[model samples]
Target: MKITNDTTTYEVAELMGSEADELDGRIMMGLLSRECVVDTDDLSEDQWLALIDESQKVRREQFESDEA
Candidate 1:
């Protein structure tokens, strides 16, 4: 399935855990941070903010983990 936020779009996929290891940094981090997503309309403002914050943290962690 296709999912989009404005002009940014990606297709939903199912892959093995080993496949996840080969993903690029931003893609991996974005997916990791958004693991908690449900329906966007059900999310309160604070709830959405939590995702944004989580994304930032995930980016930092992935960069550190993968770069180290």
Candidate 2:
């Protein structure tokens, strides 16, 4: 699903496949924080990859820290 901003988009089902509700929560938080912007027209492949990587790291940390 495309986020509220036009620049950013994500595959909701794909993320759910990995992190379930955790990923969705993080994305919501990011949106509320005004930290989830993407220049879809300008970003390169690496940029997209980096965004996904960073998102995964943050979500993973949330999962670990919350359960600890």
Candidate 3:
């Protein structure tokens, strides 16, 4: 994730996530906010909440797995 001229890094999650299929640098980061920080504003509510909820389900599963 260093930035110079021609080189940039994308995390594994980002790479595999819906990004590369369609991207605009700034836009990606804007949405990326939801990944870690989570967000609320302007809900186009269903879509935003759906993604947020899905992410939580995945994490909740991961946590249980880790404890197991």
Candidate 4:
């Protein structure tokens, strides 16, 4: 599917497993850190998907390091 913000676009899917949980944690952290706005209603679908992509990248790196 295609997700877009005011200026960017992403073709992505809903994250699953640890990635989903990780993204949730990151969002919460953003809130706690005051990096995100008080209301998440302002965030676009593309922003949420971008967080999932970031979480997936971290997960991939951790898996790779463990295998090394």
Q: What are the RMSD figures for all models against the true structure?
A: 9.6, 5.2, 12.0, 10.2
Which candidate gets the maximum TM-score versus the true structure? 2
Clash count (model 4, backbone only): 0
- Which scores better on lDDT, 1 or 2? 2
What clash pairs does model 2 have? none
Scored by lDDT, the top model is 2
| Number of residue pairs clashing in candidate 1, backbone atoms closer than 3 angstroms, sequence gap of 3 or more or interchain | 0
Q: CA lDDT of 34 in candidate 4? A: 52
Selected candidate, larger TM-score, 1 vs 3: 1
Candidate 3 overall Cα lDDT vs. reference? 0.44
Comparing candidate 2 with candidate 4, which one achieves the higher lDDT? 2
Provide the overall lDDT of each model, using Cα atoms, as 2-decimal numbers: 0.44, 0.51, 0.44, 0.44
Q: What does candidate 2 score in Cα RMSD to the true structure?
A: 5.2
lDDT of 3 at 59: 54
lDDT (10s digit) by residue, model 1, range 1-68? 22344312122212212322333324533553366443445557776556545655765677889976
Better-scoring candidate (TM-score), 1 or 2: 2
Candidate 1: worst-modelled 10 consecutive residues by lDDT = 7-16
Q: Candidate 1 clashing pairs?
A: none
Please write out the lDDT profile of model 3 over residues 1-68, one tens digit for every residue.
32223422243235335543222333334444544433334345576556545655665565688986
Specify the poorest-scoring 10-residue window by lDDT in model 4: 7-16
Model 1 misses residue 63 by how many Å? 0.5
In model 3, what is the error at residue 26, expressed in angstroms? 17
Question: Which parts of model 1 are misplaced by more than 4 Å?
Answer: 1-36
Clash pairs for candidate 4: none
